[PDB]
Amino acid sequence: PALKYGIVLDAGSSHTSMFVYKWPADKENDTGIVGQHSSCDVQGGGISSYANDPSKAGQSLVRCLEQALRDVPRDRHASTPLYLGATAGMRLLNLTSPEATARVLEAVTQTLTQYPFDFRGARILSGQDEGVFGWVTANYLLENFIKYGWVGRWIRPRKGTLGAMDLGGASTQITFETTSPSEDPGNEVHLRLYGQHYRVYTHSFLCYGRDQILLRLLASALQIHRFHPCWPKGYSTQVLLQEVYQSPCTMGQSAIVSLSGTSNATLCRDLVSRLFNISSCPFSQCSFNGVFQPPVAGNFIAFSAFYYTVDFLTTVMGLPVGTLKQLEEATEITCNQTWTELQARVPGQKTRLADYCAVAMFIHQLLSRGYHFDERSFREVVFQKKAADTAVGWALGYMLNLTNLIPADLPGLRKGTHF
Ligand SMILES: Nc1ncnc2c1ncn2[C@@H]1O[C@H](COP(=O)(O)OP(=O)(O)NP(=O)(O)O)[C@@H](O)[C@H]1O
Ligand SMILES: [Ca+2]
C-alpha cells in the first residue's frame, strides 16, 4: 500500500551495517508490522577503528548510503528518518579518548547530513539500550506483544516473551522478562507496550564480546603459558604485543612474540574459567563479576556470535549442541583438533577458524557458569539470527522507539476490554 521507510545504521565494534525498514503508512502502530526492506554491510572496520583518522569514518558509510538512495523511493527520501547508533567499540573509545570519539561522531554526522534523508542524529547507545532494543526487536517480530484470547477468555498466564542474548564483538547483553524483585536499578527495566507492563531484566558485559574475550585469552595465554591451549596444534602466528595490550579490556593483564597452539581442551577450559569472577556477590543472587541476576526463565533467542559459533559447531564440525553436555562435548572435540584436522573441514577462507575452540568454550562457560543455565532452562534457548525475514538485533527496536511506532496503550484503550 502507501509505504513508509526508516533507516538505522548499526555502528558496532567490528562493523557497520545499514538497515532499511518499511511499513504500511496506515497500519503503522500494529505490532509486527514493520519489516526489513534491505540492508547493506559497510566494508572494513567499525567507526571506532578510525579513531586516529576520523574523516574516513564518514567516508566508509558512502557506498551503503548510495544503496539507500536506490532502496528507498525518491519521493520518500525527505520524510525517511535516518539514525545511527553506536555500541561497545565507541563506548570503549570513549574510555580512551572522548575527543577522538567526538571527532568520529562529527565525521559520520557530517557525511549523513549530505544525504536527502531526514537525518535524526548519530548517538552512542548505553548497554541497557542495546540490550532492551534487541529484546524489543525479537518480541515485536514474533508478535509476542499481542494479547491472545478473546473477550471473557484471555489466555492466562499472558503470552510469554522471548529473552535475548547478544554476543557482539566488544560486549555481550542478556535481557529477559522476570517476575523476580529487582535488587539493582541499573538492571531494572519497565516497559509499557500495547497497554501491557513488562518487567524486564537487562545487563551488558563490556569487554565480554567475542573479539575482546579473544584478546584477553591471548594476553592470559602469553602470561601463563607462552603457548595458546585454545589454538590448535600446528597453528602459530606472530603476535604484536602493542595490539594485545592497547585495549581497555586487556591493559590490566619483544614488540613481537611467536605464539603456537597446543589443542589442549582442559587448559583452554582453565584459561576461559578465569574470565568469570564468582568470588563475591553483594546481592541475593549474581551472574558473575558481582552483577545481580535473577534466575533465567522462559525461552531465549541467542543471536550474533552465539549463532555464528553454534552454526560452525553444527554445520562445519557436524556436532549436536541440543544440550549443555552436547555443547561441552562439541567444544572438547573442536579444541582437540589439530590445525591440519581443522583446516580440512573448511575448504574455503579460514579467517576466524583458529578461534572457534576458544569462543565455543567461552560460550559454554558464559551460559552455564555465568548466567546459570542448566539443562532444563537451556532446552528453551534457540540459536537464530533472523525472525520474519528481518535481522534480529537492536536496530529495529531502536527505530521503533525513536519513531514512536510502539504505542504505550491501544487506541481508546480498546474500550477497557483488556483491564
Ligand atoms: N558472518 C560471520 N560469521 C562468523 N562470525 C562473524 C560473522 N559476522 C561477524 N562475526 C563475528 O562475530 C562477532 C560479533 O559480530 P557482530 O555482532 O557484528 O559484532 P558488533 O556489532 O560489531 N560488536 P558490538 O559493538 O560489541 O555489538 C564479531 O567478533 C565478528 O567478527
Ligand atoms: Ca552489535
DSSP characters over 374-404: -HHHHTTEEE-SEETTEE-SSHHHHHHHHTT
User: What is the grid cell recorded at 261?
Assistant: 597452539
Q: How far apart are CA 269 and CA 342, in angstroms?
A: 19
Nearest CA to ligand 1 atom 9: 305
* Continuous H helices in 81-199: 88-96, 98-112, 127-141
Question: Is the Cα dihedral 314, 318, 324, 328 positive or negative?
Answer: negative
Residues 6+ apart with CB under 8 A from 252: none
Residues 6+ apart with CB under 8 A from 366: 172, 208, 276
Ligand closest in space to the Cα of 311: 1
Q: How far apart are CA 77 and CA 98, in angstroms?
A: 33
Distance from Cα 361 to the centre of ligand 2, integer Å: 21
Q: How far apart are CA 111 and CA 61, in angstroms?
A: 8
CA proximity to 172, closest of 213, 141, 140, 133: 213
CA proximity to 319, closest of 308, 305, 329: 329
Q: Is 361 left (phi over 0), alpha (psi -120 to 50) or beta?
A: alpha
Quick one: how many helices (H) and strands (E) in the chain? Answer: 15, 18
Phi, psi of 148 (to 5 degrees): -80, 140
Distance from Cα 40 to the centre of ligand 1, integer Å: 15
Pick out the residues of the known binding site for ATP: 169-173
CA proximity to 15, closest of 82, 89, 71: 89
Q: May I ask the CATH class of domain 1-125+389-419?
A: alpha beta
Give 296's DSSP letter.
Answer: P
User: What is the grid cell recorded at 392?
Assistant: 534480529
Q: Which atom of ligand 1 is nearest to the CA of 393?
A: 17
HEC-encoded secondary structure of 18-85: EEEEEEECCCCCCCCCCEEEEEEECCCCCHHHHCCCCHHHHHCCHHHHHHHHHHCCHHHHCCCEEEEE
Ligand closest in space to the Cα of 209: 1
The angle subtended at Cα 240 by Cα 105 and Cα 229, nearest 5°, is: 110
Phi, psi of 243 (to 5 degrees): -70, -35
Q: How far apart are CA 262 and CA 264, in angstroms?
A: 5
Residues 6+ apart with CB under 8 A from 287: 174, 203, 293, 370, 371, 372
Q: Which atom of ligand 1 is nearest to the CA of 10?
A: 21
- Mutation to probe ligand 1, out of 308, 351, 394 (largest number of atoms < 8 A from CB): 308
Distance from Cα 50 to the centre of ligand 1, integer Å: 18
Q: Which residue has the cell 539507500?
A: 68
Residues 6+ apart with CB under 8 A from 72: 5, 7, 20, 37, 80, 117
Give resolution in angstroms.
2.1
H or E element, residue 166:
strand 163-167
CA proximity to 3, closest of 66, 68, 72: 72
Nearest CA to ligand 1 atom 3: 308
Ligand closest in space to the Cα of 89: 1
Q: Which residue has the cell 501491557?
A: 196
Write down the domain spans for the chain: 1-125+389-419, 126-388
5 by DSSP, 3-state: which? strand
Cβ distance 267 to 229 under 8 Å? yes
DSSP strand E in 262-371: where?
Answer: 300-303
How big is the chain by its Cα radius of gyration, in Å?
A: 22
Same fold, 1-125+389-419 and 126-388: yes
Residue type for 265, please? A
Technique used = X-ray
Residue type for 187, please? N
Distance from Cα 373 to the centre of ligand 2, integer Å: 23
In CATH terms, the fold of domain 126-388 is Nucleotidyltransferase; domain 5 (3.30.420)
Q: Which atom of ligand 1 is nearest to the CA of 87?
A: 25
Question: Is the Cα dihedral 66, 70, 71, 77 positive or negative?
Answer: positive
Pick out the residues of the known binding site: 169-173
255 by DSSP, 3-state: which? coil
User: What is the grid cell recorded at 190?
Assistant: 519497565
Q: Rounded to whole angstroms, what are the CA distances from 57 to 8, 63, 103?
A: 16, 12, 9
Phi, psi of 414 (to 5 degrees): 50, 40
Q: How far apart are CA 56 and CA 60, in angstroms?
A: 6
Q: How far apart are CA 38 and CA 416, in angstroms?
A: 38
- For the annotated catalytic residues, the residue numbers are 130
For β-strands 188-193 and 196-206, DSSP reports them as: antiparallel
Q: Which atom of ligand 1 is nearest to the CA of 170?
A: 26
H or E element, residue 10:
strand 3-11
DSSP strand E in 274-315: where?
Answer: 300-303
Ligand closest in space to the Cα of 211: 1
Cβ distance 244 to 219 under 8 Å? yes
Q: Which residues line ligand 1 (CB under 6 A)?
A: 12-15, 46, 87-89, 168-171, 209-211, 304-305, 308, 352
Nearest CA to ligand 1 atom 2: 308
Distance from Cα 12 to the centre of ligand 2, integer Å: 5
Q: Which atom of ligand 1 is nearest to the CA of 303?
A: 17
Q: Rounded to whole angstroms, what are the CA distances from 59 to 51, 107, 112, 198?
A: 14, 8, 10, 41
For β-strands 149-150 and 188-193, DSSP reports them as: unpaired
Distance from Cα 375 to the centre of ligand 1, integer Å: 27
